[PDB]
């Protein structure tokens, strides 16, 4: 009874590993602006795969007349698909095909990620079954609770596709989402596609 | 299982003890200015080995526009490498080869440090294998939660190399890091003129 | 294992009994001015034996540029050696030979103190080993949590040596320490060596 | 082992049941003026048996220059001996022979009280050892935490001597104590000595 | 485990055969405005108080000793089968109008079953029956242990139907009076009033 | 402008010739632990209370009506020239032992002058004299209107020296007793005790 | 009449008020209450710096602790020293009395100010003003508070008649003790053994318009 | 009875206008880090001219043992003299000759500043007396209380000397001060010394 | 004395009415997101004319390293100039010629605005001199402290030029400013299709 979360980084839903039942499908949510530091926002948690997309994930429900959202915060970040996004900002409707899809599955045991911090793909531990190879992705670099090194352990630190533009911003209070100004953000670097060469590799493993 | 942290005190990653899987590698963070009293800053914890260096570790992520850092506190201290560093306070780019590197490893048991509080090397417990010899380093001397003596039990109270200037300061809101004005700080004195005054220690594990 | 703490009441470090390994050596800290009730200040706890002596044990570290101490209170009490104290208050340097030394050791079991509340030496429980005899010392007399009776069970309530002037005070924000004006403070009386006779006696025991 | 507490209601120290080791001796403290609600003040707890008597039991220690007591609270109540108390108030020194003494012992199991709520002595449960008979005394009658009924379960609800003036009051800030104005206070009544007849009876039992 | 019985008379109830009686008291139903995390169920020992007073919020019943600070004053106690006059009474006059109760050590945890019609619901398969009654549900709000979850408690099953099941006590008035509303807190069906009320049974696995 | 007189007896003082009397009461010296911004000077009307009670902190003297919440209980009243027994008394017994007072409409603001020796200090140049006394300074701390500034008040000049100038009242005890200390609050010089005390005079510009 | 003027003798003798100004009262020179609120001003130019009764606990409303219980943390107090030299050990409320400076408060016809030269010369009083005393510039409140720094210089409190190696003492409240102050020449404003220091200190004068 | 403040921007004290008495002399303090927004830090206020220099202006007094400073803040800024400052940071002692001197004077009326927001020197109002010409300096640009436009009215917005490096930073907790990294900071610009040409001019006037 | 503020709605400073000294010149700030309720953001106040534009007006000064801005709030709205602005959200440098310019002047008396709430130009009071004709603009419509009608008394409720897009938004923590999605906002409707629907006003002073 363990959860494993998969981000396709495309507009297509991923399929769960053979022998793992699909629990639900969603949209890949990376980060919620000004949340509690008491809240973990790892891509490896169920909370990063949301069944319904909306520019206001902070609201309990998506009907303002029933659940009214009080706080100031309306910026949210979502991993992106491989479709290139126009400079002109977009609305809740037109943004959908640019958002990454995801799935959550019932895993026989807890999955962990291993990292080489060089260009080699690190091996899975001795008796474990391998699930995917990736590039190391570490957003939570601050010395917070679960941060830095501890985050590297989660399936959420290993994305399958290297990307110049790994994610997009959503303004809540405005109902808009647009591409991200900075490049190569949060990719963990090593101790043209010459950028891809600078990036740590990883593998996600499970004991079955 | 159990975690074991190594600080090289150099711009070179340490190697994990033969037989212990390496989990990650980073930079040696010693202290974050003014935190929750109960939150612990020991060199023996995984939290002291950060995969990415930045002059602002208080921020959740390293992009200002994504994670805004609200609080006042922006001082951080990092183990310096064996390099001699100039009088000019530097920035997040220049400072990198001056910061100590570190590694975290999965140990088979809980490692502990022993101290002699004199100039002799204290012996490891009866059936315990030895990992390293060092000098006693005790930053947390106040009578806080897990301070003083209880800090001496930690592998983080045993650094391999003595150094006049063991660490450096980083101003967050200034994006700058300089060398530390005071010398021979946090070393635990006895009950190369200084090397003599300093307690000696050893880190052991029951394998 | 468990912890045992010894206060020599002299400027020499005590040796651990019964072949118990010595963890470390320090100075005997009795009490911190205005601590929370949540923080216990017993002479039987490791936190009473500090590796480095400083007129300001409230600071996390002993360099003020690194660790700034924010708050009002800097009165600290340390146990005294047998050396007589001069009238003139003294700074962090000159006080050192006047502070009691201590040691912490890994004990096979939990040490308790027994008290007679008369002039006789009380016996250890049946199958227990005797560690030291002394005088009953009870600072924590208030009806707090861990107070009175409860504090009597601690090894910290049994000082080996009777003393007119058992401890001393340290003004932090003044960086000074001087003898204590009151005499025979905190000793537990019976239900000028005439004073010594009014004092309850105790023994510290462990089950080995 | 568990704690069992005994209040003599005289100036003499009670003796612990045969086979039960005496941990310490003290003075019977019934009630501290306006403590936190989370604070239990049962006569069955160690906290009611204080090794040192003072008119200010709120202060951590008994030397004001070391431990300063900030809160306003200064009244405290102590069980009384059989010796008649004069109408003229008294000081910490002169009040000593009027206060009850008490003992704490290591018991083989948890002691409980059984109450009849009539004039018959209730029996101990089937295989339990009897420790003493008394009169039902229930101070904590309000509907607070471990109050009312819950308190009757305590050995502290069963005092051996019926008394018109069961306790005395101490004003802290004054350093004074005087006999209590009200009579027959806190005795649990039944569903010259016509009063004794109106009182519930109890027995303290332990499983040995 | 504990079992609480409310007689709804001025006589103390007897514990079911086989269960030792721990104590006896007065039936307290509710204390005006207590912190949400505090449960006021008639199946808890806290509902059976050894001494009655118009001020149960005070730690002790001598106010020169225990001073009660907070504003909150009213309390409600189950009433006995006694005609209650119109004059708001005092602590002494009121005693014989209060229900008495008893707490017992039960060999297992007792539960109440409810039919929510006029029939007597059956005890579960190998369970002993303790009493039949009418469904009584004060805690209807969707608070912590509220609504249905309170229905599980033996405290939701009173043996005697009454038009005036309980009374009010003003604390800082030292006064208690009959209650203005009628048929309050009885759980109705999915005296012609007795007919509208759900029936219940309290069972234990012995 | 107001002028307050404390007789230190059980007789009400007379207002100085020419000044209308507004009311009469009992001499309240001090209320245990009140917010710093509240001044307790004997030269303020608040020190002369029309009704005496062992609980002046309550808005009214019927507690079923005005409930007093805060912990603070003790009050001190100037005592009359009456031998006080050792038994702590109640609100009724204590009345004839309390000083009485009167408040008057004065044509100008009265001030007290002090000599801080044994001599009687002279009134300022064209000022009328009202009374001679002994220097009395309770408010010695360096609080708001404290120390010397309190010396300006007519409330710092009592006509009668006394070893026991005042008494204590426990609120939630309904009790008042004589005070343990002696010669308290009298201002000393820069019964052999009367000799040690500074002398004063209360003057007004009429 | 009008305004207050405060005089600190820095001796055990009470000063006399100048120019026939009436004396309102006499007392002891209180310099500073430990960690008072920033909303309370502690200048030696205010009446509150001259206390009629000396106590090692001036935070208390009155000097009988059974009546006025003082609750808060703040303990220490500083009084201006007299000319007589102190011993090394702390002393009690009784012994310390002859070591505390005396003072007086007077009714002035106008508000008195202080002028400073910020060198070794004595600065002149304003044109039509009479001089009241010469001194040495003394500035405790140097922080950038509400009425601090240069603004405190305007106060007659910034001009002490007597230069002193040891201008004040400390009193530990909850200890009931007072002792000599370790530091020397503290709070004197400098110029842009004892004889050397005196030269480095700015001079002042306190003036009033009568 | 009005105050007028003069900053020499040299290590020499300024002289007050003829006919204005000098009240005191000091060091030019521009800004205190993390102060109340309830605190005005204008160069035109008396609070900007401090008689004693120290790296910790936040402390009531300059003896830590008497007035203990509690808050985190130790950065302070001071206008500079014309002496060029070395790259190596300096201490409270050696920094002194680099700090600007100032004076406060008694003015017959309130002085105001006028600004051209171009390269011309603006004239003083019709019957007013001119005191000095300057370059417009506006630090308080935020929409705070006295900020922006309102600050322009104060004598403090008109400095006599244009400067590449108008001020220096002082770290408190470290006891150090060093030159400032940014250039031409806070100079109000217009609607080689080609920088001086871009700067608004001003004049400070008084009604006499 | 009294202050009078003019907004040009162009990249050109307005001129003060003949006879009124100019005190300073700036940029038109309309609104700061989420302030102290009692703090007033009217265009008739000197606080609406800021000498230096920046995308972060909440900060005390415009240097991050000197004045750190702690609070969350970083949205600001500024009167746009008659320029048509592209779909790209711009930065603090690009945005400048798009911001309305303004002037503050010392007026001899208190200026007020009158409104007709129809399409006619309302007349100035009897012996009052006229300053400008405009369109009624009322942002503060909530029943706050000095809102609704009482805002209409202010010279700041009368802008000279009607405009479909009267203002722009600035994200502080993003250092960006873009055009506003909604159109015809804050104009006060009647009791060039839109110009007709809009109340007309005049600003008068008693000189």
Numbering used by the authors:
A (entry chain C), C (entry chain B), D (entry chain D), H (entry chain C): 5 to 195, 213 to 229
B (entry chain F), I (entry chain F): 5 to 195, 214 to 229
E (entry chain E), F (entry chain E): 6 to 195, 214 to 229
G (entry chain A): 4 to 195, 212 to 229
Sentences from the paper on this structure:
Since all recombinant proteins used were prepared in NaCl buffers, and since hexamer assembly in the BM from bovine lens has recently been demonstrated to be chloride-dependent, the conformational changes observed in α2NC1homo and α4NC1homo that prevent chloride binding may hinder the final protomer–protomer assembly. Our findings of noncanonical assemblies for α2NC1 and α4NC1 homo-oligomers and the structural changes observed in the chains forming these noncanonical protomers in comparison to α2NC1α121 and to the chains in α1NC1homo, α3NC1homo and α5NC1homo could imply that chain folding is closely related to protomer assembly. It is unlikely that α2NC1homo and α4NC1homo could represent stable physio­logical assemblies, but the structures of the individual chains in these noncanonical oligomers might provide a frozen glimpse of transient conformational states in the process of NC1 folding and hexamer building.
